[PDB]
Subunit: 137 residues, 2 copies
Protein backbone atom coordinates (compact mmCIF):
# COMPACT_ATOMS: atom_id res chain seq x y z
CA UNK A 1 0.00 0.00 0.00
CA UNK A 2 1.26 3.44 -1.01
CA UNK A 3 0.84 6.35 1.41
CA UNK A 4 -1.59 7.98 -0.99
CA UNK A 5 -3.81 4.90 -0.71
CA UNK A 6 -3.53 4.59 3.08
CA UNK A 7 -4.25 8.27 3.81
CA UNK A 8 -7.19 8.33 1.37
CA UNK A 9 -8.65 5.13 2.88
CA UNK A 10 -8.15 6.32 6.45
CA UNK A 11 -9.87 9.64 5.61
CA UNK A 12 -12.72 7.76 3.96
CA UNK A 13 -13.21 5.39 6.91
CA UNK A 14 -13.23 8.22 9.46
CA UNK A 15 -15.93 9.98 7.47
CA UNK A 16 -17.84 6.69 7.21
CA UNK A 17 -17.59 6.20 10.99
CA UNK A 18 -19.10 9.64 11.54
CA UNK A 19 -21.97 8.78 9.20
CA UNK A 20 -22.48 5.49 11.00
CA UNK A 21 -22.66 7.29 14.35
CA UNK A 22 -25.56 9.36 13.00
CA UNK A 23 -27.27 6.18 11.77
CA UNK A 24 -26.86 4.61 15.22
CA UNK A 25 -28.39 7.68 16.87
CA UNK A 26 -31.33 7.39 14.41
CA UNK A 27 -30.82 10.80 12.82
CA UNK A 28 -30.09 11.94 9.29
CA UNK A 29 -27.12 14.13 8.38
CA UNK A 30 -29.41 17.14 7.96
CA UNK A 31 -31.10 16.53 11.33
CA UNK A 32 -27.63 16.37 12.82
CA UNK A 33 -26.69 19.71 11.27
CA UNK A 34 -29.93 21.23 12.56
CA UNK A 35 -29.26 20.01 16.11
CA UNK A 36 -25.64 21.17 15.86
CA UNK A 37 -26.71 24.64 14.79
CA UNK A 38 -29.20 24.88 17.71
CA UNK A 39 -26.44 23.68 20.02
CA UNK A 40 -24.14 26.51 18.92
CA UNK A 41 -26.71 29.33 18.76
CA UNK A 42 -29.82 28.67 20.86
CA UNK A 43 -28.87 31.42 23.32
CA UNK A 44 -30.22 33.87 20.74
CA UNK A 45 -33.84 32.74 20.64
CA UNK A 46 -33.86 31.04 17.25
CA UNK A 47 -36.78 30.66 14.86
CA UNK A 48 -37.49 28.41 11.91
CA UNK A 49 -36.43 31.24 9.58
CA UNK A 50 -33.04 31.41 11.33
CA UNK A 51 -32.66 27.64 10.92
CA UNK A 52 -33.74 27.76 7.26
CA UNK A 53 -31.06 30.32 6.40
CA UNK A 54 -28.40 28.37 8.32
CA UNK A 55 -29.16 25.10 6.52
CA UNK A 56 -29.67 26.88 3.20
CA UNK A 57 -32.98 25.05 2.95
CA UNK A 58 -36.55 26.09 2.22
CA UNK A 59 -39.18 26.56 4.92
CA UNK A 60 -41.05 23.35 4.06
CA UNK A 61 -37.97 21.11 4.45
CA UNK A 62 -37.15 22.88 7.74
CA UNK A 63 -40.72 22.42 9.02
CA UNK A 64 -40.74 18.65 8.49
CA UNK A 65 -37.27 18.36 9.98
CA UNK A 66 -38.30 20.36 13.04
CA UNK A 67 -41.50 18.30 13.24
CA UNK A 68 -39.40 15.11 13.20
CA UNK A 69 -37.01 16.38 15.87
CA UNK A 70 -39.91 17.60 17.99
CA UNK A 71 -41.73 14.23 17.74
CA UNK A 72 -38.59 12.75 19.35
CA UNK A 73 -38.52 15.64 21.88
CA UNK A 74 -34.92 16.48 20.95
CA UNK A 75 -36.17 20.05 20.59
CA UNK A 76 -38.93 22.17 22.03
CA UNK A 77 -40.76 25.14 20.57
CA UNK A 78 -42.73 27.89 22.27
CA UNK A 79 -44.53 31.07 21.24
CA UNK A 80 -42.44 34.19 21.93
CA UNK A 81 -44.07 36.16 24.77
CA UNK A 82 -43.55 39.48 23.01
CA UNK A 83 -44.35 38.32 19.47
CA UNK A 84 -47.28 35.92 19.18
CA UNK A 85 -46.46 35.28 15.51
CA UNK A 86 -43.02 33.95 16.35
CA UNK A 87 -41.96 30.55 17.71
CA UNK A 88 -38.54 30.02 19.27
CA UNK A 89 -36.72 26.70 19.24
CA UNK A 90 -34.46 25.19 21.90
CA UNK A 91 -32.66 21.89 22.45
CA UNK A 92 -33.97 19.59 25.15
CA UNK A 93 -31.71 17.70 27.53
CA UNK A 94 -31.93 14.73 25.17
CA UNK A 95 -31.08 16.95 22.17
CA UNK A 96 -28.00 18.32 23.88
CA UNK A 97 -26.89 14.79 24.82
CA UNK A 98 -27.41 13.55 21.24
CA UNK A 99 -25.25 16.33 19.75
CA UNK A 100 -22.50 15.65 22.27
CA UNK A 101 -22.75 11.93 21.58
CA UNK A 102 -22.34 12.43 17.85
CA UNK A 103 -19.42 14.79 18.42
CA UNK A 104 -17.76 12.19 20.68
CA UNK A 105 -17.11 9.94 17.64
CA UNK A 106 -13.98 11.93 16.81
CA UNK A 107 -12.43 11.48 20.26
CA UNK A 108 -13.48 7.81 20.11
CA UNK A 109 -11.69 7.27 16.79
CA UNK A 110 -8.58 9.00 18.15
CA UNK A 111 -8.53 6.60 21.09
CA UNK A 112 -9.02 3.60 18.77
CA UNK A 113 -6.06 4.84 16.70
CA UNK A 114 -3.81 5.46 19.71
CA UNK A 115 -4.65 2.05 21.22
CA UNK A 116 -3.17 0.20 18.22
CA UNK A 117 0.35 1.12 19.26
CA UNK A 118 2.52 1.32 22.36
CA UNK A 119 3.48 4.69 23.87
CA UNK A 120 6.91 5.13 22.26
CA UNK A 121 5.60 3.77 18.95
CA UNK A 122 2.91 6.47 18.97
CA UNK A 123 5.58 9.10 19.60
CA UNK A 124 7.68 7.95 16.61
CA UNK A 125 4.59 7.60 14.44
CA UNK A 126 3.42 11.12 15.20
CA UNK A 127 6.92 12.52 14.75
CA UNK A 128 7.27 10.85 11.35
CA UNK A 129 3.78 11.88 10.21
CA UNK A 130 4.74 15.43 11.17
CA UNK A 131 7.88 15.13 9.03
CA UNK A 132 5.65 13.85 6.24
CA UNK A 133 3.15 16.71 6.60
CA UNK A 134 6.05 19.16 6.65
CA UNK A 135 7.47 17.76 3.39
CA UNK A 136 4.17 18.40 1.59
CA UNK A 137 4.18 21.99 2.83
CA UNK B 1 3.25 20.68 18.41
CA UNK B 2 1.51 17.70 20.00
CA UNK B 3 -1.03 16.80 17.34
CA UNK B 4 -3.67 14.09 17.22
CA UNK B 5 -3.57 11.41 14.51
CA UNK B 6 -6.87 12.87 13.35
CA UNK B 7 -5.41 16.35 12.88
CA UNK B 8 -2.39 14.83 11.14
CA UNK B 9 -4.37 12.63 8.72
CA UNK B 10 -6.76 15.47 7.89
CA UNK B 11 -3.86 17.88 7.30
CA UNK B 12 -1.88 15.44 5.18
CA UNK B 13 -4.96 14.77 3.04
CA UNK B 14 -5.59 18.48 2.78
CA UNK B 15 -2.05 19.21 1.62
CA UNK B 16 -2.13 16.42 -0.99
CA UNK B 17 -5.41 17.83 -2.37
CA UNK B 18 -3.85 21.30 -2.42
CA UNK B 19 -0.78 20.04 -4.30
CA UNK B 20 -3.05 18.49 -6.95
CA UNK B 21 -5.03 21.74 -7.19
CA UNK B 22 -1.75 23.63 -7.61
CA UNK B 23 -0.78 21.30 -10.44
CA UNK B 24 -4.09 22.09 -12.19
CA UNK B 25 -3.40 25.81 -11.78
CA UNK B 26 0.10 25.34 -13.23
CA UNK B 27 -1.41 23.61 -16.28
CA UNK B 28 -4.05 26.37 -16.51
CA UNK B 29 -7.06 24.06 -16.18
CA UNK B 30 -9.96 24.11 -13.73
CA UNK B 31 -10.95 21.09 -11.63
CA UNK B 32 -13.95 20.44 -13.88
CA UNK B 33 -11.78 20.70 -17.02
CA UNK B 34 -9.35 18.20 -15.50
CA UNK B 35 -12.22 15.80 -14.78
CA UNK B 36 -13.39 16.14 -18.39
CA UNK B 37 -9.91 15.46 -19.77
CA UNK B 38 -9.44 12.51 -17.40
CA UNK B 39 -12.72 10.99 -18.54
CA UNK B 40 -11.74 11.37 -22.20
CA UNK B 41 -8.33 9.86 -21.36
CA UNK B 42 -9.95 6.81 -19.78
CA UNK B 43 -12.37 6.28 -22.64
CA UNK B 44 -10.16 7.26 -25.61
CA UNK B 45 -11.33 4.15 -27.45
CA UNK B 46 -15.13 4.46 -27.70
CA UNK B 47 -15.76 7.52 -29.84
CA UNK B 48 -17.34 9.63 -27.12
CA UNK B 49 -20.02 12.21 -27.73
CA UNK B 50 -20.90 15.38 -25.79
CA UNK B 51 -23.90 13.50 -24.44
CA UNK B 52 -21.69 10.66 -23.19
CA UNK B 53 -19.56 13.19 -21.34
CA UNK B 54 -22.65 14.92 -19.91
CA UNK B 55 -24.03 11.60 -18.64
CA UNK B 56 -20.64 10.68 -17.15
CA UNK B 57 -20.10 14.04 -15.43
CA UNK B 58 -23.80 14.29 -14.63
CA UNK B 59 -23.85 17.89 -15.78
CA UNK B 60 -26.22 19.62 -18.18
CA UNK B 61 -25.69 19.86 -21.94
CA UNK B 62 -24.94 23.61 -21.85
CA UNK B 63 -22.41 23.14 -19.04
CA UNK B 64 -20.61 20.46 -21.03
CA UNK B 65 -20.88 22.54 -24.20
CA UNK B 66 -19.05 25.45 -22.52
CA UNK B 67 -16.45 23.13 -21.00
CA UNK B 68 -15.70 21.54 -24.37
CA UNK B 69 -15.56 24.91 -26.14
CA UNK B 70 -12.88 26.02 -23.66
CA UNK B 71 -10.82 22.84 -24.01
CA UNK B 72 -11.12 23.03 -27.81
CA UNK B 73 -9.96 26.67 -27.81
CA UNK B 74 -6.85 25.45 -26.01
CA UNK B 75 -6.49 22.64 -28.59
CA UNK B 76 -6.52 19.98 -25.88
CA UNK B 77 -9.41 18.26 -27.65
CA UNK B 78 -10.89 18.08 -31.12
CA UNK B 79 -14.48 17.47 -32.13
CA UNK B 80 -15.95 16.17 -35.38
CA UNK B 81 -19.34 15.16 -36.79
CA UNK B 82 -19.86 11.38 -36.74
CA UNK B 83 -19.86 10.07 -40.33
CA UNK B 84 -22.69 7.63 -39.71
CA UNK B 85 -24.91 9.96 -37.65
CA UNK B 86 -24.89 13.69 -38.45
CA UNK B 87 -26.58 14.37 -35.10
CA UNK B 88 -23.53 13.17 -33.16
CA UNK B 89 -20.32 15.04 -32.44
CA UNK B 90 -17.43 12.84 -31.34
CA UNK B 91 -14.59 14.12 -29.15
CA UNK B 92 -10.98 12.99 -28.83
CA UNK B 93 -7.86 14.24 -27.04
CA UNK B 94 -5.14 15.91 -29.08
CA UNK B 95 -1.46 15.10 -28.50
CA UNK B 96 -1.34 17.98 -26.03
CA UNK B 97 -4.49 16.93 -24.20
CA UNK B 98 -2.90 13.54 -23.60
CA UNK B 99 0.34 15.16 -22.46
CA UNK B 100 -1.52 17.50 -20.08
CA UNK B 101 -3.41 14.64 -18.44
CA UNK B 102 -0.22 12.63 -17.95
CA UNK B 103 1.58 15.69 -16.59
CA UNK B 104 -1.22 16.26 -14.08
CA UNK B 105 -1.31 12.62 -12.98
CA UNK B 106 2.46 12.70 -12.34
CA UNK B 107 1.83 14.73 -9.16
CA UNK B 108 0.62 11.65 -7.27
CA UNK B 109 3.80 9.65 -7.91
CA UNK B 110 5.75 12.79 -7.07
CA UNK B 111 4.06 13.14 -3.66
CA UNK B 112 4.51 9.46 -2.93
CA UNK B 113 8.25 9.75 -3.54
CA UNK B 114 8.42 12.91 -1.41
CA UNK B 115 6.72 11.08 1.46
CA UNK B 116 8.87 7.95 1.18
CA UNK B 117 12.09 9.97 1.12
CA UNK B 118 11.37 11.41 4.58
CA UNK B 119 12.00 8.03 6.20
CA UNK B 120 14.55 5.23 6.09
CA UNK B 121 13.65 1.89 4.51
CA UNK B 122 12.88 0.43 7.95
CA UNK B 123 10.82 3.41 9.13
CA UNK B 124 8.74 3.25 5.93
CA UNK B 125 8.02 -0.46 6.42
CA UNK B 126 7.01 0.31 10.02
CA UNK B 127 4.86 3.33 9.07
CA UNK B 128 3.00 1.40 6.34
CA UNK B 129 2.36 -1.58 8.61
CA UNK B 130 1.14 0.74 11.39
CA UNK B 131 -1.10 2.77 9.09
CA UNK B 132 -2.44 -0.55 7.81
CA UNK B 133 -3.19 -1.68 11.37
CA UNK B 134 -4.84 1.67 12.10
CA UNK B 135 -6.96 1.54 8.95
CA UNK B 136 -8.09 -1.95 9.95
CA UNK B 137 -9.06 -0.77 13.43
CA UNK B 138 -11.38 1.83 11.88
CA UNK B 139 -13.01 -0.77 9.64
CA UNK B 140 -13.73 -3.46 12.24
Amino acid sequence: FTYSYLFRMISHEMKQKADQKLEQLDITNEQGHTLGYLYAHQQDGLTQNDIAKALQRTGPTVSNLLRNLERKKLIYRYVDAQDTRRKNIGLTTSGIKLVEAFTSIFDEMEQTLVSQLSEEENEQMKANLTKMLSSLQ
